[PDB]
Nucleic acid binder design. Structure first.
Lengths: 81, 166, 92, 109, 97, 87, 97, 93, 107
DNA sequence: ATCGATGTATATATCTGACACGTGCCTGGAGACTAGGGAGTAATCCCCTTGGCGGTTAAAACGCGGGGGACAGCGCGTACGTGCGTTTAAGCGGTGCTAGAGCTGTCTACGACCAATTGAGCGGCCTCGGCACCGGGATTCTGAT
DNA sequence: ATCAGAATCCCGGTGCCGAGGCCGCTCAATTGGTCGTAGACAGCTCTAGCACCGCTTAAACGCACGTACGCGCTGTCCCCCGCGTTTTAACCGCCAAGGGGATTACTCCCTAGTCTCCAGGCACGTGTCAGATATATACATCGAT
C-alpha cells in the first residue's frame, strides 16, 4: 500500500470544502488538506490499534475506533458505545 | 401530548425585557408609602417581600447630555432648599443627568443615600432613553426602606455630609 | 444478550410524537446519546462523591452533576423532572 | 416475592429502566454504595433529555414532510437548538451532515 | 451555448452538499489509506467494516469543521479564496500541532 | 452642599492599562479602542462560567465559603486545569 | 526626548513577557468576582487562595486569547488587534457559536 | 494530616540536580502535576478494564494507559521505566 | 520479620504503598494487581524526573539555584512532548514564553 | 429584459427493503429480611475571613500633538472556475475460504481481608544562605544631526 | 556615519525570611496466612473479513479559455501612542470580631447481600407501508443578445 493519500482526490476535497461552505479553493489547499487528514488519521488509528492490542484482538472494531475518538475529544454517535 | 416548555434563553431574556418595559410604563408602584425617618427626613417603606433581581422603582426624570449635566446640578444647588434629585451616569462615551427636582408622580427621586441600604441601581434603555431602574439585589422584608448608593465621592460634600459614608 | 435503550426510546417517542417512527440508524444514535449522557452524569457524580469524602452516590450527587453538565435551561428542567420523579417514587 | 411486583420505573412514572440504571451505577465502579433515589433521578433526567431531543427531531422530520426520524433530523434538531448544541458541541453524529449555512460575503450581488 | 458566471455553480454545489448527508470521500480509497496507516503501527491488522465507516465519518466531520473555520479565516482576511495560511491559522488557533 | 448621583460597575475595575498589560504579555503591539469593552465582555463571560461551577461545587459540599479546590475543580470542568493551588 | 511609536510597545512586551506577576489589580478583581458570585448564591465567602486561583486562571485565559487575537490580526495583514479579531479567535476556539 | 508528594519530588530532585533547591510554590505545582498525571493514568486504566469487562487493573492496563496518554517519546521511555521497575520488583520478593 | 518498603524493592523514590492505597480508595476497579502501583509509581517518578531536570536546566540558565513556577513553565513550554502533555494546563505564577511575532519587530 | 436553456419544486405510480408487531422464554429485576457501617446531627474550638482606619504612593485618568497604520480605491496578471472529451477505477454482486471473534469449562495463581508491629512520614523549630534590593560602572539600544 | 544619552546589564553587599535539616510521635505500610474467585488457557463453532473476478458507469482527469479576484501600490485621514500632570484608590499594616470549617461522638436507618419468584425484554419471524426513484407539469432562475 503505497501513496494512498492521493486517493483523497482533488474533487473529493473540493466536495468536502463545498460542504464546509467554501466558495473558491486555492490550488495549494489540496496537499495541505492531505497532510492534515494523514495527521488526524495517524492519531486516531494509533489510539484504536492501541485499544485493540490491549484487548489482545487483531480486528480493529467500531468500538475501538469510537473509543479512540472519544479520547481525542471527538465523540462519535452512531457506532455503539 | 408530551411537549417541552423550555423557552430558549433568547425567549427568557426578551420576556424579562418586555416585562420591564410594561412594568415601567405601568406606574403600578406596588406598596410603597412615604413616612418619616429619625434624622434623614422622608422615607419610602416598601411593603412587599422582595428577592434577588426583582424590580423596585424607576428613578423617573429628565435625561440630558453632559455639557449641561456638569452645570444644571450646581445651578439647582444655588437654591439651598433643593435636596438631592439629579443622577449622572456614564454610558457609551457620554455622561448624563436625571433632572428630578421638579416633583413627579413617581417614587424614584424620593430616596436618600447610603452604602448600607438594600438597593444597587442598574440602567435600562426602553428605545434609547436610559431609564434609571432600581432592582432588589438582595432579600428585602415587607417593612424595610428603599436605600441605595449615589456613587458620589465628592470630598467637599462628604466633608459637609459625614453621613454619606453610611 | 445485548443491552440497549431502544424500546425505551421507542416509548418516549410514541409519547411525544405518537404518529412518527424512527429509523434504525437514528435509533443507534439515540442509544449512543443516552449512553454518553449517562456516562457523563455518573462520572461527575463519582467525582463529587470523591471530593466530599462520601461513599454513596445519591440524588444530591446526581442533581449536582446534572447542574454541572447541562447548560442553563436544560439543567433547570432536568432537575425539575428528576426531583418530581424522586418525590413520586418515595411517595409510592 | 408476593404482593405482586411493579417495576421501579412504573412506581416512579418513567419510561426508562430504573432497574437497569441501578445495575449500571453498581457495575460501573462509580462509588461503593448507590442510593435508592439516585437511579430514579438519573433515569428521569435521561428520559427528559431523550424526550427533549426527540421532540425537535420529530418537528424537523415533520417540516421536511417525513414520518421516520433519521440522523439528518437528529443533527438538525441538535445543531439548531441553542443548548443541546452546547451539551453536544463536540459530538459527531453519523450521517448527519451540517446545517445549511452560506456566509453572507459569498452570495451574489 | 449557455454558461454561468464563475461562482454560481459553486453556490449550487454548496447548497447541494449541505442538503445531503452521504459520505464525500470514495470508500475504497479511504479504506486503502486507513489500512496503510494502520499497517504502520501493527502488521497484519484486520478491520471491521463498521470500524472503517466510523473512521470515515469522523474524518469527514473533522475536515468539514476545519473547512468552516478555514472559510472564516479567509473571510477575515477580506478574501473569498481559502489558502494554506488559512488552514494553518485555523489549526493553530484551534490548538492542533 | 448638594451632591450629584453616579454609578460604578466593578467591571470597569479591569482598567484600560490593565487590559493593555495583558495584551502586551500576549505579544500585542498595537491595540484598537474597542478591544477594552470586548475584553471586558469576554472576561465577564469566562468568570461567570467558572464561578457558577465553583459555587455549585460549594453548595453541594454544604459550605458557605468558596475554597480554592472548588475553583480548581470548576476550572478542570471547563477544561483549563490549573496547577499550584492544591489540585 | 521622544521615542518612535512602537519602541515603547516592544519594550513593554519584553518587560511583561519576562515577568510573572499578576497584571490585573487584586482588589478590583476581587470586587468583580464577589459581584459576579452574588448572582448565584448570596452571602458567599471566598478563600483568598480561591480569589488568587480565579485571577491566575482569568489572566492565563486573557493572555492566550490575546495571543490568538494577535495571530488573527497579523493574518489580516494588520498590526492593530480589533474586536473582529477577538471574535474570530473565540469562534474558532469554539466559545461562541 | 494531609498527604502529598513533597518528599518524593525532593528525592527525585536531589537525584537529577544534586545542588539545587525548589521553592514552595514550585513544590505545590509539582504536587498538582503528580496528582493530575496519576489521575489521568488511573482513569484511563479503569476505563480500559471496563472496556474488556475485566475487574483487575494490572501492569498491562497501566502500560496501555501510559501508551495512550503520553506523547510518543515520553510514552516509550515511561513504558521502559515501568517495565524495568516491575521486573526488578518481581525478581526480589 | 524485618520490613523494607516496596519502593525499595523496585528502586523507586515514589511511594508504591501510597500509590496502591490511592488506586484502591479511588474507585478505579474492584481489584488492583500487584505490579499496577509499581508501574504507576515508576511512571510518575519518570515524568517528574523529566520535568525537574528541564526546570533545573532553566534555573541554571537563569543563574539561580531554586526552581520556581517560572522555570517549570519554561521547561514545559520548551519541551515539545511535555508541552503536548500539559498543553491544556496553566501554571500559577508561570508567565508566558518570551515570543514576539516577527511582523511587529522594527524593520 | 423576454428567450430559452437549465435546473428545480410539485404529483403521481410503485415497489423494495426496512420497520413495527406478535411469541416463547430466560435471565435479570423485584420483594422480604437481616446486619452493619456510613452518614446525619449536635457541640466545640479556633482559624481565617470580613470590615474599618490611615497614610503612601504607585498607578490610573485625562489632555494634547502627531505620525503611522487602517482602509478605500485602482490596475494588473494569474490562477481558479467551468465545461467537455476521455480514461480509470469505484462499486455492485457473486462465490469461496479461513482467520479469528466469541463463548464455555477447568483450575490455579492472585488479590482481598485480617491482625500485629514498626518505622516512615509529618508537624513544629531553628538556622543560614539565596534571592531581592539598592546603589554604581559600563555598554548597548534608539534617535536627531 | 556621528554622537550623546537614557535604559540596561554586570557587580557588591547587605538583609530577611523561607527553605532545608532535626527530632519526637503515630498511623499506615509491611508481613504472614487464608480463601475464594477472576482470569488464563485450551477447545470448539461459525461469523465475517478478505480476496478475487467481471461488468457498468460514474466519477476523476486532463485541456483550454476566460475573467474574478489576489495582491501590490498610493493617498488620506484619524485614531492610537507617547508624554506630562493630576487624582484616586490600590495596598500595606494593624486591629477586632465572629462566622463557619473541621473534627469528634453517637445513633439510626439505609444500602448491600441473599434467596426466591416471575414477568419483561430479546431474538425471531412476518406483514405492510414509507420513501426513493421515474417520469411528467408547471415553474423559477439567471445569463446574455
Amino acid at each position: 500500500l503505497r501513496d494512498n493519500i492521493q486517493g483523497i482526490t482533488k474533487p473529493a476535497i473540493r466536495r468536502l470544502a463545498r460542504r464546509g461552505g467554501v466558495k473558491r479553493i486555492s490550488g495549494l489547499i489540496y496537499e495541505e488538506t492531505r497532510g492534515v487528514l494523514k495527521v488526524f488519521l495517524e492519531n486516531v488509528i494509533r489510539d484504536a490499534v492501541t485499544y485493540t492490542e490491549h484487548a489482545k484482538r487483531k480486528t480493529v472494531t467500531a468500538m475501538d475506533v469510537v473509543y479512540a475518538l472519544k479520547r481525542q475529544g471527538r465523540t462519535l454517535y452512531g457506532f455503539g458505545g | 401530548v408530551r411537549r417541552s416548555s423550555r423557552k430558549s434563553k433568547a425567549e427568557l431574556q426578551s420576556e424579562e425585557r418586555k416585562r420591564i418595559d410594561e412594568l415601567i410604563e405601568s406606574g403600578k408602584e406596588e406598596g410603597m408609602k412615604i413616612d418619616l425617618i429619625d434624622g434623614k427626613g422622608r422615607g419610602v417603606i416598601a411593603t412587599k417581600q422582595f428577592s434577588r433581581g426583582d424590580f423596585v422603582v424607576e428613578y423617573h426624570g429628565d435625561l440630558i447630555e453632559i455639557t449641561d449635566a456638569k452645570k444644571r446640578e450646581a445651578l439647582y444647588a444655588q437654591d439651598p432648599s433643593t435636596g438631592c434629585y439629579m443622577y449622572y451616569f456614564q454610558y457609551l462615551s457620554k455622561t448624563y443627568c436625571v433632572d428630578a427636582t421638579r416633583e413627579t408622580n413617581r417614587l424614584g427621586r424620593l430616596i436618600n443615600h447610603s452604602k448600607c441600604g438594600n438597593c444597587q441601581t442598574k440602567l435600562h434603555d426602553i428605545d434609547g432613553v436610559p431609564h434609571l431602574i432600581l432592582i432588589a439585589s438582595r432579600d428585602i422584608a415587607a417593612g424595610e426602606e428603599l436605600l441605595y448608593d449615589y456613587g458620589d465621592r465628592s470630598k467637599a460634600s462628604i466633608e459637609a455630609h459625614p453621613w454619606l459614608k453610611h | 444478550r445485548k443491552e440497549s435503550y431502544s424500546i425505551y426510546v421507542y416509548k418516549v417517542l410514541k409519547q411525544v410524537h405518537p404518529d412518527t417512527g424512527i429509523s434504525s440508524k437514528a435509533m443507534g444514535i439515540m442509544n449512543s446519546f443516552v449512553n454518553d449522557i449517562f456516562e457523563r452524569i455518573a462520572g461527575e457524580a463519582s467525582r463529587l462523591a470523591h471530593y466530599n469524602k462520601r461513599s454513596t452516590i445519591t440524588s444530591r450527587e446526581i442533581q449536582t452533576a446534572v447542574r454541572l453538565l447541562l447548560p442553563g435551561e436544560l439543567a433547570k428542567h432536568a432537575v425539575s423532572e428528576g426531583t418530581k420523579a424522586v418525590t413520586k417514587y418515595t411517595s409510592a | 416475592a408476593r404482593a405482586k411486583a411493579k417495576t421501579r420505573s412504573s412506581r416512579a412514572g418513567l419510561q426508562f429502566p430504573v432497574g437497569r440504571v441501578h445495575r449500571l451505577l453498581r457495575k460501573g465502579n462509580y462509588s461503593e454504595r448507590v442510593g435508592a433515589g439516585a437511579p430514579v433521578y438519573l433515569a428521569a433526567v435521561l428520559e427528559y433529555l431523550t424526550a427533549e431531543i426527540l421532540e425537535l427531531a420529530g418537528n424537523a422530520a415533520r417540516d421536511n414532510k417525513k414520518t421516520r426520524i433519521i440522523p439528518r433530523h437528529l443533527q438538525l434538531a441538535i445543531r439548531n437548538d441553542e443548548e443541546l448544541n452546547k451539551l453536544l458541541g463536540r459530538v459527531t453524529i453519523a450521517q448527519g451532515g451540517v446545517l445549511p449555512n452560506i456566509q453572507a460575503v459569498l452570495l451574489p450581488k | 451555448p449557455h454558461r454561468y458566471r464563475p461562482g454560481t455553480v459553486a453556490l449550487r454545489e454548496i447548497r447541494r452538499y449541505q442538503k445531503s448527508t452521504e459520505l464525500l470521500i470514495r470508500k475504497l480509497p479511504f479504506q486503502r489509506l486507513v489500512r496503510e496507516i494502520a499497517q504502520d503501527f501493527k502488521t497484519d491488522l484486520r478491520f471491521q467494516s463498521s470500524a472503517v465507516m466510523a473512521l470515515q465519518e469522523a474524518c469527514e466531520a473533522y475536515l468539514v469543521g476545519l473547512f468552516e473555520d478555514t472559510n472564516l479565516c479567509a473571510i477575515h482576511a477580506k478574501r473569498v479564496t481559502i489558502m494554506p495560511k488559512d488552514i494553518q491559522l485555523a489549526r493553530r488557533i484551534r490548538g492542533e500541532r
